[PDB]
UniProtKB/Swiss-Prot annotation, chain A:
<feature type="domain" description="PDZ 2">
    <location>
        <begin position="8"/>
        <end position="93"/>
    </location>
</feature>
<protein>
    <recommendedName>
        <fullName>Tyrosine-protein phosphatase non-receptor type 13</fullName>
    </recommendedName>
</protein>
<comment type="subunit">
    <text>Interacts (via the first PDZ domain) with PLEKHA1 and PLEKHA2. Interacts (via the second PDZ domain) with TNFRSF6 (Fas receptor) (via C-terminus). Interacts (via the second PDZ domain) with TRIP6 (via the third LIM domain and C-terminus). Interacts (via the third PDZ domain) with NGFR (via C-terminal SVP motif) and PKN2 (via C-terminus). Interacts (via the second or fourth PDZ domains) with PDLIM4 (via C-terminus only or via combined C-terminus and LIM domain, but not LIM domain only). Found in a complex with PDLIM4 and TRIP6.</text>
</comment>
<comment type="function">
    <text>Tyrosine phosphatase which negatively regulates FAS-induced apoptosis and NGFR-mediated pro-apoptotic signaling. May regulate phosphoinositide 3-kinase (PI3K) signaling through dephosphorylation of PIK3R2.</text>
</comment>
<comment type="similarity">
    <text>Belongs to the protein-tyrosine phosphatase family. Non-receptor class subfamily.</text>
</comment>
From Swiss-Prot, chain B:
<feature type="short sequence motif" description="PDZ-binding">
    <location>
        <begin position="4"/>
        <end position="6"/>
    </location>
</feature>
<comment type="subunit">
    <text>Forms homooligomers. Found in a complex consisting of ARHGEF4, APC and CTNNB1. Found in a complex composed of MACF1, APC, AXIN1, CTNNB1 and GSK3B. The complex composed, at least, of APC, CTNNB1 and GSK3B interacts with JPT1; the interaction requires the inactive form of GSK3B (phosphorylated at 'Ser-9'). Interacts with APC2. Interacts with DLG1 (via PDZ domains) and DLG3 (via PDZ domains). Interacts with alpha- and beta-catenins. Interacts with AXIN1 (via RGS domain). Interacts with ARHGEF4 (via N-terminus).</text>
</comment>
<comment type="similarity">
    <text>Belongs to the adenomatous polyposis coli (APC) family.</text>
</comment>
<protein>
    <recommendedName>
        <fullName>Adenomatous polyposis coli protein</fullName>
    </recommendedName>
</protein>
<comment type="function">
    <text>Tumor suppressor. Promotes rapid degradation of CTNNB1 and participates in Wnt signaling as a negative regulator. APC activity is correlated with its phosphorylation state. Activates the GEF activity of SPATA13 and ARHGEF4. Plays a role in hepatocyte growth factor (HGF)-induced cell migration. Required for MMP9 up-regulation via the JNK signaling pathway in colorectal tumor cells. Associates with both microtubules and actin filaments, components of the cytoskeleton. Plays a role in mediating the organization of F-actin into ordered bundles.</text>
</comment>
Amino acid sequence: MKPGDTFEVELAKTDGSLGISVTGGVNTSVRHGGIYVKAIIPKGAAESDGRIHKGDRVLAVNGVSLEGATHKQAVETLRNTGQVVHLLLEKGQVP
Amino acid sequence: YLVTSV
């Protein structure tokens, strides 16, 4: 419960699903790059980290920035990965 | 589209 907090979570997606439904994206008026969670799966890999809620910001994945990434590109950036998804997540809680 | 489980 602090601002400026980042969690680098490493997950292995279970049959093509970490467990987050993506929203936001550069196409929306976000911080010029970032995908965000709209919905958490109850007990996929993502929720099994669980420091996420339905508010947080994905800034980078596998060390790969969501720079210029929109809905489709953000999926591609999470989905077409080398199994391990190191999610660089920022707080969905404002200062 | 939005909201894609991945």
